[PDB]
């Protein structure tokens, strides 16, 4: 590819090798999400400012009833929350799940009732909320 096996790389040759490699975005977002997560763990690349809304372990309420993936009501920013949930590196999850570790009250703050009602089904508690600051507590 032009990427040597002995002489080190720079920005220019890395970009040229990458572009020479075929454009590679066709798989499901979650498989490559896990791949990015694993590479960040192995290579200490979790330090990216983008690392908390696109790949792994965050919960939210994007629906008037959770476990009901079909209800949608205007009057809040559920769409914007979904649009954000695909950016930094925490997984799009707004369904009753057990293995999820992060629960975050959404911009639709009226669903604190729903958040807590399905929190009983959850094994993780809600934190006092604060990329990482719209209404969030992943710390």
């Amino acid at each position: 590819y032009g990427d040597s096996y002995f002489i080190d790389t720079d920005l220019n040759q890395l970009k040229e090798v990458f572009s020479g490699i075929k454009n590679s975005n066709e798989q499901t977002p979650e498989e490559m999400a896990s791949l990015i997560a694993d590479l960040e763990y192995r290579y200490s690349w979790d330090c990216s400012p983008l690392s908390m809304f696109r790949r792994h372990t965050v919960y939210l309420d994007s629906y008037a009833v959770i476990n009901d993936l079909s209800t949608k009501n205007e009057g809040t920013r559920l769409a914007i929350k979904a649009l954000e949930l695909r950016f930094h590196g925490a997984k799009v999850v707004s369904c009753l799940a057990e293995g999820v570790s992060h629960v975050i009250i959404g911009e639709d703050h009226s669903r604190v009732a729903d958040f807590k009602a399905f929190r009983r089904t959850f094994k993780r508690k809600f934190k006092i909320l604060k990329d990482k600051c719209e209404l969030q507590e992943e710390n």
């Binding site: 002995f6 002489i7 009057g75």
Partner: protein, 201 residues
């Protein structure tokens, strides 16, 4: 049918005016109920038909203009381009409106009003209608204000997050660039070292 809050102030008396409670037939050229009240007496009324062609030879308008003429005579004030007399013949319980154009005056249609007393109840109904429509308009006002400010804050938040994301895509691009560069540099260092090790016999 429909009541409308429109007071065509009668030149003959100020204590009575034709409020609009129009029960319009197939056309306003046809009869409909107009109730004018005093507080001491009330009067409904209907318009006699055919009163359209009387101006047809007079000013030579076109058909259907009588419908708009009647509607704007019923609504508050006179016609924007049609002269009307706003009064009431209490003696005969009758209303009339004018129509003049092209250098000659003429007499438009008229209301053959019918006297129905007890102005108290009809005035109560009219003022209740006023209060209720004010209340519904205020409710629409406050709802529109709420949704407007909600979309305002939504717009501000999405602007902020969009700016964050447009900076961040290139930020992570360059970060991943340098990260891959250094990782592959270390891989090449390992390859060089292993080559040197293999060089030995």
């Amino acid at each position: 049918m429909e009541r409308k809050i429109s007071r065509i102030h009668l030149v003959s008396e100020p204590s009575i005016t034709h409020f609009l409670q129009v029960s319009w037939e197939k056309t306003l050229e046809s009869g409909f109920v107009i109730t004018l009240t005093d507080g001491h007496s009330a009067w409904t009324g209907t318009v006699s038909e055919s009163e359209i062609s009387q101006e047809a030879d007079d000013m030579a308008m076109e058909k259907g203009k009588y419908v708009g003429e009647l509607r704007k005579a019923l609504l508050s004030g006179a016609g924007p381009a049609d002269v009307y007399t706003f009064n009431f013949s209490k003696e005969s319980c009758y209303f009339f409106f004018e129509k003049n154009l092209k250098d000659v005056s003429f007499r438009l249609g008229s209301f053959n009003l019918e006297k129905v007393e007890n102005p108290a109840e009809v005035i109560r109904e009219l003022i209740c209608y006023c209060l209720d429509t004010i209340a519904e308009n205020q409710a629409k006002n406050e709802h529109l204000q709420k949704e407007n400010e909600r979309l305002l804050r939504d717009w501000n938040d999405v602007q902020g997050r969009f700016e964050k994301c447009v900076s961040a895509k290139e930020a992570l691009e360059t970060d991943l660039y340098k990260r891959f560069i250094l990782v592959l540099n270390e891989k090449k260092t390992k390859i060089r070292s292993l080559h040197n090790k293999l060089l030995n016999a």
